[PDB]
Amino acid sequence: RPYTVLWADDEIDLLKPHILFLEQKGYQVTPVLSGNDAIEAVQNNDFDIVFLDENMPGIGGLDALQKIKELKPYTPVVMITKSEEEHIMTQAIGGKIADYLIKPVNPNQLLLSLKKNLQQHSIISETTNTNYRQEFVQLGTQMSGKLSFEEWKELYRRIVFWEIELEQADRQMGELLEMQKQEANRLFARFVTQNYREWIAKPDTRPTMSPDLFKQKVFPLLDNGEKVFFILIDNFRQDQWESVKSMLSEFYTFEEDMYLSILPTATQYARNAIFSGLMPLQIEKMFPDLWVDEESEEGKNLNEEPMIRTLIERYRKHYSFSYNKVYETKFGERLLGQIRSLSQNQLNVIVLNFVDMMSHARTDSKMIRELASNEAAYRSLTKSWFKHSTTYNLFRSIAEMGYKVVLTTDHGTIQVKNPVKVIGDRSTNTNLRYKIGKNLDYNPKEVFEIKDPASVGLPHNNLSDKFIFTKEDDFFAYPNNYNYYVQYYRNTFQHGGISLEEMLVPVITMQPK
Amino acid sequence: RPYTVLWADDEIDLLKPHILFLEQKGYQVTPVLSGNDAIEAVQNNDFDIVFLDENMPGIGGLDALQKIKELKPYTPVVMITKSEEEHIMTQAIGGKIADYLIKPVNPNQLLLSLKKNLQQHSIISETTNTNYRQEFVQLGTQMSGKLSFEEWKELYRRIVFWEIELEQADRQMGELLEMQKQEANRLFARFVTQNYREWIAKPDTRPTMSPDLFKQKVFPLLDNGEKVFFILIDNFRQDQWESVKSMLSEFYTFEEDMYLSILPTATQYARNAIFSGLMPLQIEKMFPDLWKNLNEEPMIRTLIERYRKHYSFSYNKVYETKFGERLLGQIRSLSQNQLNVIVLNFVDMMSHARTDSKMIRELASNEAAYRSLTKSWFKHSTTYNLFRSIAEMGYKVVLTTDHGTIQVKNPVKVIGDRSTNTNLRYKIGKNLDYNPKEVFEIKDPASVGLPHNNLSDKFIFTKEDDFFAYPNNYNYYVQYYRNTFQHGGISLEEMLVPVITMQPK
Ligand code: BEF
Ligand code: BEF
Ligand code: BEF
Ligand code: BEF
Ligand SMILES: [Cl-]
Ligand SMILES: [Mg+2]
Ligand SMILES: [Mg+2]
Ligand SMILES: [Mg+2]
Ligand SMILES: [Mg+2]
Ligand SMILES: [Mg+2]
Ligand SMILES: [Zn+2]
Numbered sequence A: 001r002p003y004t005v006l007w008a009d010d011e012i013d014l015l016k017p018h019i020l021f022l023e024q025k026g027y028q029v030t031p032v033l034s035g036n037d038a039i040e041a042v043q044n045n046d047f048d049i050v051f052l053d054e055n056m057p058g059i060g061g062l063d064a065l066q067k068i069k070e071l072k073p074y075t076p077v078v079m080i081t082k083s084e085e086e087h088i089m090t091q092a093i094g095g096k097i098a099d100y101l102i103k104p105v106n107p108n109q110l111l112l113s114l115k116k117n118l119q120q121h122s123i124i125s126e127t128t129n130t131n132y133r134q135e136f137v138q139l140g141t142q143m144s145g146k147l148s149f150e151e152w153k154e155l156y157r158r159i160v161f162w163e164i165e166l167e168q169a170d171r172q173m174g175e176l177l178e179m180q181k182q183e184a185n186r187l188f189a190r191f192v193t194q195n196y197r198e199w200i201a202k203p204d205t206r207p208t209m210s211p212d213l214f215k216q217k218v219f220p221l222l223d224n225g226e227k228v229f230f231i232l233i234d235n236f237r238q239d240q241w242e243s244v245k246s247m248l249s250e251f252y253t254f255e256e257d258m259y260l261s262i263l264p265t266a267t268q269y270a271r272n273a274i275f276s277g278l279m280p281l282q283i284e285k286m287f288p289d290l291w292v293d294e295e296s297e298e299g300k301n302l303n304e305e306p307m308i309r310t311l312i313e314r315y316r317k318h319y320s321f322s323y324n325k326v327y328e329t330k331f332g333e334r335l336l337g338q339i340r341s342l343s344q345n346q347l348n349v350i351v352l353n354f355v356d357m358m359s360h361a362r363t364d365s366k367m368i369r370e371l372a373s374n375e376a377a378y379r380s381l382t383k384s385w386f387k388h389s390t391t392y393n394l395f396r397s398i399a400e401m402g403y404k405v406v407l408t409t410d411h412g413t414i415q416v417k418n419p420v421k422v423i424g425d426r427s428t429n430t431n432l433r434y435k436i437g438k439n440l441d442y443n444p445k446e447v448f449e450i451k452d453p454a455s456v457g458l459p460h461n462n463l464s465d466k467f468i469f470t471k472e473d474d475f476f477a478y479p480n481n482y483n484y485y486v487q488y489y490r491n492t493f494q495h496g497g498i499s500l501e502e503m504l505v506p507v508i509t510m511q512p513k
Numbered sequence B: 001r002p003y004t005v006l007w008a009d010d011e012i013d014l015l016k017p018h019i020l021f022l023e024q025k026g027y028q029v030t031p032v033l034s035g036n037d038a039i040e041a042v043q044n045n046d047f048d049i050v051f052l053d054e055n056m057p058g059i060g061g062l063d064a065l066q067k068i069k070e071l072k073p074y075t076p077v078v079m080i081t082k083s084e085e086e087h088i089m090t091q092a093i094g095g096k097i098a099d100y101l102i103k104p105v106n107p108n109q110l111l112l113s114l115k116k117n118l119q120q121h122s123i124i125s126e127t128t129n130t131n132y133r134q135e136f137v138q139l140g141t142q143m144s145g146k147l148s149f150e151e152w153k154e155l156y157r158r159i160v161f162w163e164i165e166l167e168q169a170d171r172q173m174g175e176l177l178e179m180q181k182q183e184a185n186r187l188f189a190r191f192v193t194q195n196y197r198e199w200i201a202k203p204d205t206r207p208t209m210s211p212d213l214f215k216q217k218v219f220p221l222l223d224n225g226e227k228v229f230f231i232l233i234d235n236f237r238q239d240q241w242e243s244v245k246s247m248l249s250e251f252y253t254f255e256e257d258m259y260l261s262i263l264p265t266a267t268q269y270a271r272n273a274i275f276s277g278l279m280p281l282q283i284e285k286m287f288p289d290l291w292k293n294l295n296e297e298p299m300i301r302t303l304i305e306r307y308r309k310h311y312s313f314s315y316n317k318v319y320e321t322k323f324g325e326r327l328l329g330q331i332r333s334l335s336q337n338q339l340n341v342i343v344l345n346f347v348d349m350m351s352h353a354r355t356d357s358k359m360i361r362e363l364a365s366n367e368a369a370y371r372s373l374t375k376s377w378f379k380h381s382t383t384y385n386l387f388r389s390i391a392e393m394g395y396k397v398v399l400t401t402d403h404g405t406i407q408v409k410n411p412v413k414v415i416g417d418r419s420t421n422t423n424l425r426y427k428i429g430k431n432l433d434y435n436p437k438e439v440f441e442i443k444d445p446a447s448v449g450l451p452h453n454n455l456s457d458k459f460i461f462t463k464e465d466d467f468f469a470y471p472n473n474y475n476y477y478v479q480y481y482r483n484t485f486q487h488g489g490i491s492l493e494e495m496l497v498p499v500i501t502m503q504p505k
């Protein structure tokens, strides 16, 4: 079918050449001479696009625009006018013009506007598909052999880019990308299992990990005289950063990086290591009062403010600081109210827990299983949360306050698929990606077993002597109710183990505009 | 802060007059000579906008575009080029350019591009805020006096328009709109309570209501030889329709209307009325085993036969993702039927589960959030692809709902017995004790087509955005339910609901 163009201009005879050109390109043009005729035509037809003059006897083009946009908000309107007046331009933009062309007009400029306003999505979709096919082999090479840490960061960033871009592209491309990501996770699990014990043993040569994060990314700003908000969104994957960065770009410029969470990729271990600057085992040894056992009923992350204080002292720094923890926008609304009273501190730490709650809810909440059924829906829901919770205005307020922001997380999460059998663990019956126990029964081939937890900076109970971790998108399952257990947890989001999504996480340094 | 412009052109010397024009208007222009220089400049700075030539010694501008969009996806890029080749246009569009200007360029056209691409949101917001203030008095007049049903539809449509337009704009203006809406709902409750009984008693002259919907909106299409999908989205109000229609407009043209749900504005009553063509009193009589929506296909069958028609039809209900993906995979097999009825469930918003309840408080705390969630569900559930596939089958689509929901605000006291129903907007009981001035009171359910067991059974309905609260733990339940989304009562949102006739493009 040919696209239809309604063209209102009182001097349409002067546009004959351009109409002929459009008709030769395959467009059907209906010309009218006034804004009232244009309104009537839009009322009784479904034109694909409207071209409007501004200065016409009768109602002006800007008045016609308003009425047309009321009738057919979804139809593009292009203003084609001789006026060079800035206030006309501004009122056209404000009336939701799709484009604005000052006369005289090159007919090819009209063709550009038609392609862009009527076929942008299918043109971008085809170009994406072409570009992915032309890079598919390069990506497979990019993840081959042995990669440096910096190469893993680039690779994972490129895979996430394609995951998002291929939402808007041919499905078969999705299947190809899924399989490439599957391979990347298999290779990354290898990379981690081969080096992990040595990363903990040799702190000087290891990539930035949870206990290094404040020293590497926060202290240098503070020591250079900058005021910093450290915003920890629990359970925030790289692809969620990518989904919210466009919104934040209105208020901040970015320095984007990633770092490695320790194992287990879980709050009790990684987030306390962030805020203490220590491996969990060093927290227990140096500050036994701050470390809560895994078997305890006491909350595991209630000593982060004392931990931060010890970390600041340990490095002989004297920074003033605050610490606030948020679970609901409502207490988040309180914090937003009192946010400017934090302007006295060099360092203001905010923990947002809602995304972690939402993520766990993908297991037991029917609403969340529908709203985050897959990873594209998860990202979309993350964007809606960010925008319509107090988070958006928190970031906007902080920017007005002139603070730099360090936006990061303690770990990500991964959608799990295939079960791994296990038995006999203690106090880890809740977690599906790592277990702690003594006489654990499992297949050593299917996990990463730590038989010496003290070698990788982990404490434990006397009743437990080992950790085991799942890799890739496996999840632990018990035999006694295996088949219900497998059906219930398949395709849920889980953290604690080894994967790109869980361990390779964003840390963004942001400067207000 | 000054807006910064990166401008890559091998002939930037010839563009000195344009640079000067822009610098006089406050723009800071950095000129570079090549695509590689432009990439490096973008990599090491934070320009607000990039102006890019196509044909330059070294890499092509289309190559620079791709890399710049990779580094800074949120930065707009305007192609300024002597090229008029269609394939260059297409590649630029496909590379996500913001604008494409063919040389020679009027410097005022550059200015237009800078305003549109850097200040559009703030320009639209101020225009909306100004335009709302200019209409404020006229809108108050529009809802004054005695409004016909058609005038109620136009007023509600205009209020919803301003509600959505104003969410991208001044917060105080939206608060004024909220008050106007509250006054509209007060006046609409009066319109309903004054007319409700007469409407049910007079099918030949009443506005279109639940039991009339098929007769009024579906059968005339089928009698005209058209084939129809009747898609009913549970609990989908007018502002939710307005939130998803731009997505649908890629595939359909629209004839938009609204109709009135019966009371209670709840699925067991309104949706069974739709599919049977009867009031619930008669439904319960004739389909006791289906009286609470388990299979409605027999109802639809009896409705068709009652009107002496012979339509082939299917009936399908999608509760969750699993079965929506199935239906989508087999959707063309429904081509054998003249009438295909699909029921889609939106997310349950009255779930008392602890988790579901916590999710709602964060994710749907206000109406803008509720609309955003609807758009996300529509796009990433199978719903969007369903509508897309049906459009390829050449069917007319009637898209509708059985009732809406309203965000409740203030409590209304009621005392009932232990068997009293749980709904926050309507109550049924023999022992109900309430202030009659605060509710719409139906002392005899049978006289407005509602079933009941006891002579002393009554229905009472909240109006506006009230909700019922029992005395026991009144303070706890008032805090717990305030600002939740509920249905069953009398409001524009719950009762005046969309029915859209769509034709595939
Ligand atoms: F008269 Be139109 F504005 F060129
Ligand atoms: F509470 Be954390 F996400 F393990
Ligand atoms: F050399 Be540019 F394309 F005008
Ligand atoms: F099922 Be409906 F939302 F009452
Ligand atoms: Cl070990
Ligand atoms: Mg004119
Ligand atoms: Mg005029
Ligand atoms: Mg050139
Ligand atoms: Mg070149
Ligand atoms: Mg009675
Ligand atoms: Zn965590």
Ligand SMILES: [Zn+2]
Pocket: A235, A267, A356, A360, A495
């Ligand atoms: Zn968690």
